Write a protein that binds this DNA or RNA. Structure first.
Length: 74
RNA sequence: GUGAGCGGCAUCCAAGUUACGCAUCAGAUUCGAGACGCGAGUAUUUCCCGCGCGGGG
């Protein structure tokens, strides 16, 4: 719906991710945190981590991913 | 539900033992407390001065 660039600045050193660190995963974690603060810790995390403001890419076989690239590490 | 979540670098240990700031050097030569303080002068006048008054022997 719009093309975006996400930049994050660190005040403390982070753990260098062994594998790809994906923007959609972080957004899902933040969404789960929001729904935890709004409902509590009894929620199922798998029921709210796809309610993200990101449009999806679907392939021929129905396999789908979020259009959110993995974080670049400089 | 961020290859996420969970996870003490921690325990013990002597910088200590011996060693001389010591030996040798002139504060010396030169010069007065003795000199100094109106005790001597032998009486009426002018050009100018501070300006009627104050002044130059």
């Amino acid at each position: 719906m719009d093309f975006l660039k996400v930049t994050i600045n660190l005040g403390s050193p982070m753990v260098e991710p062994g594998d790809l660190f994906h923007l959609d995963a972080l957004l899902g974690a933040l969404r789960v945190s929001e729904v935890r603060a709004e409902l509590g810790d009894g929620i199922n995390p798998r029921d709210h981590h796809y309610d993200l403001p990101l449009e999806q890419y679907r392939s021929r076989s129905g396999q789908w991913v979020f259009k959110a690239s993995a974080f670049h590490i400089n």
